[PDB]
Amino acid sequence: STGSATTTPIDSLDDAYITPVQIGTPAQTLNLDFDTGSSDLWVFSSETTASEVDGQTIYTPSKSTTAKLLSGATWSISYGDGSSSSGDVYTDTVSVGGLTVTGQAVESAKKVSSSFTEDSTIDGLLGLAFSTLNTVSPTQQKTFFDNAKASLDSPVFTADLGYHAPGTYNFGFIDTTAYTGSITYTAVSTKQGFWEWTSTGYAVGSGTFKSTSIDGIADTGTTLLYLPATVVSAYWAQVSGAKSSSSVGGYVFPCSATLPSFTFGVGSARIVIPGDYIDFGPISTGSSSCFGGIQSSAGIGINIFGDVALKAAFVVFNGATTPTLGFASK
Numbered sequence: 323s324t325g326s327a328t329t330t331p332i333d334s335l336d337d338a339y340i341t342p343v344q345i346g347t348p349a350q351t352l353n354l355d356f357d358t359g360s361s362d363l364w365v366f367s368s369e370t371t372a373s374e375v376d377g378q379t380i381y382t383p384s385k386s387t388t389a390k391l392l393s394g395a396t397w398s399i400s401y402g403d404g405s406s407s408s409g410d411v412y413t414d415t416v417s418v419g420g421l422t423v424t425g426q427a428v429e430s431a432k433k434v435s436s437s438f439t440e441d442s443t444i445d446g447l448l449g450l451a452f453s454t455l456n457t458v459s460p461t462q463q464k465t466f467f468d469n470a471k472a473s474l475d476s477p478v479f480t481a482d483l484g485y486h487a488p489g490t491y492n493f494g495f496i497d498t499t500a501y502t503g504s505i506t507y508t509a510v511s512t513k514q515g516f517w518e519w520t521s522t523g524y525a526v527g528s529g530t531f532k533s534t535s536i537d538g539i540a541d542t543g544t545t546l547l548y549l550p551a552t553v554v555s556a557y558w559a560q561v562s563g564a565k566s567s568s569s570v571g572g573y574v575f576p577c578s579a580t581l582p583s584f585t586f587g588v589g590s591a592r593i594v595i596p597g598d599y600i601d602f603g604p605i606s607t608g609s610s611s612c613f614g615g616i617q618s619s620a621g622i623g624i625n626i627f628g629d630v631a632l633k634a635a636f637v638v639f640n641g642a643t644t645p646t647l648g649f650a651s652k
């Protein structure tokens with residue numbers, strides 16, 4: 323089997339991407355944030371504290387003939403950015419772009435933190451990291467991909483995120499028309515539950531490539547590119563007026579600037595992020611100070627290849643017995 327679904331930026335800055343997902347019988351379609359940095363499929367639901375729902379579409383398991391309460395199971399998750407959610411668990415039929423999994427754990431939110439409430443466009447998350455990170459207790463549950471894997475033509479999914487445009491998540495096949503050149507594959511460590519890999523270096527604009535190992539994760543659920551302070555300082559030093567602002571919470575730059583590209587290495591291959599991808603617009607409405615798309619990971623504990631990086635590539639998440647990651651230009 324295979325599946326193919328269009329993913330759409332939630333706003334004009336590509337702050338996140340949503341993908342329609344069918345849950346239950348008859349289908350209830352919710353728009354979920356596909357997140358390769360976590361491993362829970364959770365949704366706003368009929369059980370969510372009413373005051374914490376503001377515009378989201380909810381899953382109502384009582385209206386699904388295939389929904390079953392997973393007795394005694396609960397979940398609670400705290401993300402790297404400080405947001406959180408928790409609740410109970412159902413199993414139900416879940417379909418993405420024509421690919422159907424029966425008995426998928428669908429985690430129903432009873433509580434969500436303010437940042438989720440405040441984002442009316444995101445009805446939940448669909449985690450695509452390794453199932454070892456799943457928070458369901460006392461019996462850990464499998465991700466959608468993990469459940470689908472055996473049935474897929476090939477045990478892979480691909481992320482093809484657009485810049486200010488729709489893109490595609492495919493399951494079970496590689497669309498050879500979706501990228502240019504070849505796909506370069508690189509090793510993955512699953513020890514921390516993430517799609518963790520090692521970049522071979524970087525360049526800033528037309529500058530010389532610096533060969534240096536940078537360990538990090540491929541995370542579709544993170545908006546920006548978080549890299550070591552040395553790397554980030556070298557990038558922003560090329561932008562007149564750019565500076566790190568403690569008050570704003572990162573590097574900012576004049577909105578009048580044209581930004582240089584940023585290149586990262588994948589083996590002997592190179593992925594180039596155009597400068598425009600690195601512009602996240604005014605820090606506040608009407609400001610001429612703009613927020614940078616490349617930020618320091620110093621406060622995080624891990625480097626994160628988020629959407630800023632991933633949208634410059636066609637990315638293969640290879641879930642074979644020995645997982646790997648593939649990157650191609652597009």
Ligand SMILES: O[C@H](COCc1ccccc1F)CN1CCCC1
Binds near residue numbers: 360401403404447626
């Ligand atoms: O947790 C990710 C972002 O992680 C990186 C990060 C960004 C900013 C501050 C601290 C951090 F760790 C956001 N995702 C959004 C949906 C689930 C998590």
